[PDB]
């Protein structure tokens, strides 16, 4: 006969009912020293009584409506579960009694716990009795090979975990921790969320299991792992009662920084949503089912009364727990005078599910009632009769039930027995009028939209941590700027890293970089390694200061030469001292002009033409000068052996000699005008690699040797006062040549790009300038000075 505290009402058809009027049982572990007696449940749940009242109201409204099942009455045998499996199981045993004078229940509306409903459906489905639950939302109840006769008016919990992952990815967090009740409601949900979050590149720090029967040390361990972690977001998948201990311990230890992502079961629970817990838990964003509309329901709630309720039996205990009677009292108080979750509501969510379940079973019964004997759902097109209806026929009609909810909706269960709905997203607020927690809706989750466009959050209503209004930071490692790259911290997950600076020559312009990048050759990483600047080129220029200085030297020397030439064009035909070979003087002139014009060849950017001509031009001009001054000595050789031409011979001999090696280059190895970077790694250089090193050595040795023999045979006659004793002048000029050449070679041999050209150019310009001076100064001075040359 089941328990004695129950709600009961007769009728042709009887429906079952399991509601959590209490919260749990008295935890007295029977040591079995005596016969174990029937355990007792302890706490009270006004929400559960609201649900039971909703079911009773639905049945009464069905019995009152004249169209749905006329000339037939609905009865019920509603029991209490106290949220435990033992009570539900004894109740269901009282249900299926007559199967194998007692009424035979045809349908069961209840089992609000996914652990409770599992154990109930295991037993009901053995007799094929339809069980229409309203609040059990575990996914395991979708295995229609196990629970053959289980339907539910509440959506499955897959979309809830998907929505959790979507919310976490929307606020751009990647470091969370998960808590789930060690039950059939938290385990599968947390597993689904784990996979959905790992596929979205989200890292999970910790994962713990709790329950209302967990001892104190395990709660200590959980609080420790919560405190010892850096994750700010905590995804809780549990119900009110199985969460209350953890909340009490967290309030006692005063952990304040975290953010709670509430599941639907406890996001609106009065056990948790109280101010002293709110000050500590801070910000909670949770889900909620869609509201309902049961017109005329409040006026039914306001009529509950302990003496005017013979059918309902829990009304007495309700009166007691709400007024503390039997301190005996009157029984004529007002339910509106005290504030309890009973009528302190604005949106009916689970009560609407109970209403819908009762109405769906009534509609299946009507469907069986309005049959046509030819188009039935059973074998041979036959159909069943409502006077001897059995449970399996009602199950058959429920599988194919498809009707219209008074809100103008379409109600029809899937092939997995469940319905589907679109969630509201609420965020906990503190009412400035009362102090109580009030749930304000801030977002929506439409599950019909395509994957990726389902969530809609209105961010300006979310109140973060009570005061501030920017999204808190809950990443593992700080995201560091461009110029840096991620760096593995071994042991830690893929979301936690250090970041190391990029070396020079590599850059990174992106945030969250995986590796730095080498830029092309003529580019180089800048000072912040964020963008490569074209690598600086360097060479001798014209706007450059030293460029202008040597240009000044060259042009002034050429101007001196042009002055000498003009003067000689004025006074050519006077052999006063020009009795010597005037042609030899003019040839010295043009040779020195070519020398001074060889300057320009080392001023700009060296292309191949430039230096490929800058070696031979200097070569020929310099050997012309030195050979002219060589043969410009005494005619000893002439005495030993047409016109001046014979002397020309010697020069037009010796020049050609050098010229030979010259052409060698142009047909063995031109001086390559190329670049070089290895020497600086920051600034590029451009020079000319000499085509043949030993051949350049040969060239300079040839010209210098000739000048040396000139010095020898010049100072052997170094004491003859002819033409103002030019012997000392030629020796002085050649000593100038040798000093500049010697001061040139070593410093040159160890110079980098620009200064090789610089040194060579200054050496040549100085040598030729000194020659010009030391040879023409005395003569032009005595002509401009004392016009008397006869001896």
Ligand X SMILES: *[C@@H]1O[C@H](CO)[C@@H](O[C@@H]2O[C@H](CO)[C@@H](O)[C@H](O)[C@H]2NC(C)=O)[C@H](O)[C@H]1NC(C)=O
Ligand Y SMILES: N[C@@H](Cc1c[nH]c2ccccc12)C(=O)O
Inter-residue contact 475 to 174 (CB < 8 Å): yes
Instruction: Report the distance separating Cα 142 and Cα 419, nearest Å.
Output: 11
Tokens 């269901």 belong to: 92
Beta bridge partners, 426, equal 286, 441
- The one segment of 330-338, 474-482, 494-502, 727-735 that binds ligand NAG by CB under 6 A: 330-338
Q: Which of 21, 23, 16 minimizes the C-alpha distance to 5?
A: 21
Rule CB under 6 A: choose which of 92, 105, 137, 424 binds ligand Y.
137
Rule CB under 5 A: choose which of 13, 124, 350, 587 binds Cl ion.
350
Instruction: Provide the terminal-to-terminal Cα distance of the chain, rounded to the nearest Å.
Output: 161
Instruction: Output 240 or 421, the one with its CB closest to ligand X.
Output: 421
421 binds ligand X (CB under 6 A): yes
Rule CB under 6 A: choose which of 402, 406, 536, 725 binds ligand NAG.
402
Instruction: Output 91 or 202, the one with its CB closest to ligand X.
Output: 202
Inter-residue contact 771 to 625 (CB < 8 Å): yes
Nearest distance in Å: CB 394, ligand Y:
24
In degrees to the nearest 10, what's the CA dihedral of 625, 626, 629, 633? -160
Instruction: Report the distance separating Cα 484 and Cα 515, nearest Å.
Output: 8
Instruction: Report the distance separating Cα 146 and Cα 121, nearest Å.
Output: 9
Instruction: Report the distance separating Cα 500 and Cα 486, nearest Å.
Output: 6
Rule CB under 6 A: choose which of 409, 412, 414, 722 binds ligand NAG.
412
The residue sitting closest to Cl ion, measured at its beta carbon, is 350
625 binds Cl ion (CB under 5 A): no
Instruction: Report the distance separating Cα 529 and Cα 451, nearest Å.
Output: 40
- The one segment of 19-27, 414-422, 636-644, 682-690 that binds Ca ion by CB under 5 A: 19-27
Tokens read off for 273: 């949503």
723 binds ligand X (CB under 6 A): no
254 binds ligand NAG (CB under 6 A): yes
Instruction: Output 541 or 751, the one with its CB closest to its own copies.
Output: 751
Taking residue 715's Cβ as centre, other Cβ atoms within 10 Å add up to 15
Instruction: Report the distance separating Cα 434 and Cα 344, nearest Å.
Output: 13
Each residue of 640-661: b (16+ CB within 10 Å) or e?
eeeeeeebbeebeebbeebeeb
728 binds its own copies (CB under 8 A): no
- Say which entry of ligand NAG, ligand Y, Ca ion, none residue 412 contacts (CB below 5 to 8 A, set by partner kind): ligand NAG
Instruction: Output 499 or 519, the one with its CB closest to ligand X.
Output: 499
Nearest distance in Å: CB 405, ligand NAG:
11
Inter-residue contact 691 to 671 (CB < 8 Å): yes
8-state DSSP, 535: P
174 binds ligand X (CB under 6 A): yes
Nearest distance in Å: CB 211, its own copies:
8
Residues 266-295 that bind ligand Y (CB under 6 A): 269
Instruction: Output 107 or 176, the one with its CB closest to ligand X.
Output: 176
Rule CB under 6 A: choose which of 52, 62, 109, 135 binds ligand Y.
135
- Say which entry of Cl ion, ligand NAG, ligand X, none residue 479 contacts (CB below 5 to 8 A, set by partner kind): ligand X
8-state DSSP, 41: B
Tokens read off for 30: 């029977």
- The one segment of 108-116, 121-129, 172-180, 600-608 that binds ligand Y by CB under 6 A: 108-116
Tokens read off for 287: 């889900």
486 binds ligand X (CB under 6 A): no
Tokens read off for 247: 């909340």
- Say which entry of Ca ion, ligand Y, ligand X, none residue 264 contacts (CB below 5 to 8 A, set by partner kind): ligand Y
598 binds ligand Y (CB under 6 A): no
Q: At 350, phi and psi to the nearest 5?
A: -80, -35
Query: What SS3 state is found at 656?
Result: helix
Print the SS3 string covering 124-181: HHHHCCCEEECCCCCHHHHCCCCCCCEEECCCCCHHHHHHHHHHHHHCCCCEEEEEEE
Residues 347-366 that bind ligand Y (CB under 6 A): 350
Instruction: Output 53 or 427, the one with its CB closest to Cl ion.
Output: 53
264 binds ligand Y (CB under 6 A): yes
Nearest distance in Å: CB 485, Ca ion:
20
Is the sign of the CA dihedral 90, 92, 94, 97 positive or negative? negative
Site string for ligand Y, 225-254 (x = CB under 6 A): --------------xx--------------
In this structure, the strands spanning 259-262 and 283-288 are parallel
Nearest distance in Å: CB 209, ligand Y:
15
Q: Which of 346, 256, 277, 390 minimizes the C-alpha distance to 50?
A: 346
Rule CB under 5 A: choose which of 48, 113, 292, 753 binds Ca ion.
113
Q: Which of 426, 427, 425 minimizes the C-alpha distance to 454?
A: 425
Tokens read off for 773: 């001076």
497 binds its own copies (CB under 8 A): yes
Q: Which residues bind ligand NAG (CB under 6 A)?
A: 254, 256, 334, 336-337, 402, 410, 412
Q: Which residues bind ligand X (CB under 6 A)?
A: 172, 174, 201, 421-422, 444, 446, 448-449, 473, 475, 479
Q: Which residues bind its own copies (CB under 8 A)?
A: 1-3, 30-36, 85-86, 89-90, 93-94, 100, 119, 122-123, 125-126, 128, 143, 145-146, 148, 182, 187-188, 191, 195, 201, 207, 211, 213, 377-379, 390, 392-393, 395-396, 399, 486-494, 497, 500, 503, 514-515, 739, 742-743, 746-747, 750-751, 755
Q: Which residues bind ligand Y (CB under 6 A)?
A: 112-114, 135-138, 185, 239-240, 264-265, 269, 350
């Amino acid at each position: 006969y089941g328990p004695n505290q129950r709600a009961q009402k007769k009728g042709d058809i009887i429906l079952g009912g399991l509601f959590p009027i209490h919260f749990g049982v008295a935890a007295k572990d029977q040591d079995l020293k005596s016969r174990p007696e029937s355990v007792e449940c302890i706490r009270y749940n006004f929400r559960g009584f609201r649900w039971l009242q909703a079911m009773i109201f639905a049945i009464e409204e069905i019995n009152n409506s004249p169209n749905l099942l006329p000339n037939m009455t609905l009865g019920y045998r509603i029991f209490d579960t106290c949220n435990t499996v033992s009570k539900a199981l004894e109740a269901t045993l009282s249900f299926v009694a007559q199967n194998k004078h007692i009424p035979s229940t045809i349908a069961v509306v209840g089992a609000t716990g996914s652990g409770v409903s599992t154990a109930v459906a295991n037993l009901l489905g053995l007799f094929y009795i339809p069980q229409v639950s309203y609040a059990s939302s575990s996914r395991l109840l979708s295995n229609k090979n196990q629970f053959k006769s289980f339907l539910r008016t509440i959506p499955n919990d897959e979309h809830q975990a998907t929505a959790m992952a979507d919310i976490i990815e929307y606020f751009r967090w990647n470091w969370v921790g998960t808590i789930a009740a060690d039950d059939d409601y938290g385990r599968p949900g947390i597993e689904k969320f784990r996979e959905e979050a790992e596929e979205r590149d989200i890292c999970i720090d910790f994962s713990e299991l709790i329950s209302q029967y967990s001892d104190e040390e395990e709660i200590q361990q959980v609080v420790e792992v919560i405190q010892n972690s850096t994750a700010r977001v905590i995804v809780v998948f549990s119900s009110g009662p199985d969460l209350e201990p953890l909340i009490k311990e967290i309030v006692r230890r005063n952990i304040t920084g975290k953010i709670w992502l509430a599941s639907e079961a406890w996001a609106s629970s009065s056990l948790i949503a109280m101010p002293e817990f709110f000050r500590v838990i801070g910000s909670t964003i949770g889900f909620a089912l869609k509201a309902g509309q049961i017109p005329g329901f409040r006026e039914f709630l306001q009529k509950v009364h302990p003496k005017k309720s013979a059918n309902n039996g829990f009304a007495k205990e309700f009166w007691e727990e709400t007024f503390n009677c039997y301190p005996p009292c009157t029984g004529d108080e007002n339910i509106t005078s005290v504030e309890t979750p009973y009528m302190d509501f604005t949106h009916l969510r689970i009560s609407y599910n109970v209403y819908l379940a009762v109405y769906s079973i009534a509609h299946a019964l009507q469907d069986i009632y309005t049959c046509t004997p030819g188009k039935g759902l059973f074998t041979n097109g036959s159909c069943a009769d409502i006077k001897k209806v059995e449970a399996w026929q009602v199950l058959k009609h429920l599988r194919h039930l498809n009707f219209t909810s008074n809100m103008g909706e379409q109600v029809d269960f899937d092939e997995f027995g469940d319905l589907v709905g679109n969630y509201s997203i609420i965020n906990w607020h503190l009412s400035p009028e009362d102090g109580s927690v009030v749930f304000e809706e801030v977002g929506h989750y439409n599950v019909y939209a395509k994957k990726g466009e389902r969530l809609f959050i209105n961010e300006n209503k979310i109140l973060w941590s009570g005061f501030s209004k920017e999204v808190p930071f809950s990443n593992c490692s700080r995201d560091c700027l461009p110029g840096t790259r991620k760096g593995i911290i071994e042991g830690e997950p893929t979301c936690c890293f250090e970041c190391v600076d990029c070396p020079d020559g590599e850059y990174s312009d992106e945030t969250d970089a995986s590796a730095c990048d080498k830029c092309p050759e003529d580019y180089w990483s800048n000072e912040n390694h964020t963008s490569c600047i074209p690598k600086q080129i360097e060479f001798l220029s014209w706007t450059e200061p030293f460029g202008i200085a040597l240009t000044l030297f060259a042009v002034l020397g050429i101007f001196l030469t042009s002055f000498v030439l003009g003067v000689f064009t004025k006074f050519r035909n006077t052999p006063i001292v020009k009795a010597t070979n005037r042609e030899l003087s003019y040839l010295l002139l043009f040779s020195l002009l070519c020398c001074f014009s060889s300057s320009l060849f080392f001023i700009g950017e060296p292309q191949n033409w430039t230096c490929r001509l800058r070696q031979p031009a200097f070569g020929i001009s310099f050997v012309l000068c030195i050979s002219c001054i060589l043969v410009k000595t005494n005619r000893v050789l002439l005495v030993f052996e047409w016109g001046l031409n014979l002397q020309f011979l010697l020069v037009f001999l010796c020049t050609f000699v050098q010229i030979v090696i010259c052409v060698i280059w142009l047909y063995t190895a031109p001086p390559s005008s190329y670049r070089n970077h290895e020497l600086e790694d920051e600034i590029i250089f451009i020079t000319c690699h000499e085509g043949s090193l030993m051949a350049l050595g040969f060239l300079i040795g040839y010209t210098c040797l000739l000048a040396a023999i000139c010095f020898f045979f010049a100072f052997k006659s170094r004491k003859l006062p002819e033409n103002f004793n030019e012997a000392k002048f030629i020796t002085f000029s050649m000593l100038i040549f040798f000093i500049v050449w010697i001061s040139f070679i070593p410093a040159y041999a160890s110079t980098y790009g620009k200064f090789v050209s610089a040194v060579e150019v200054i050496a040549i310009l100085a040598a030729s300038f000194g020659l010009l001076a030391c040879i023409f100064f005395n003569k032009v001075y005595i002509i401009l000075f004392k016009p008397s040359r006869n001896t």
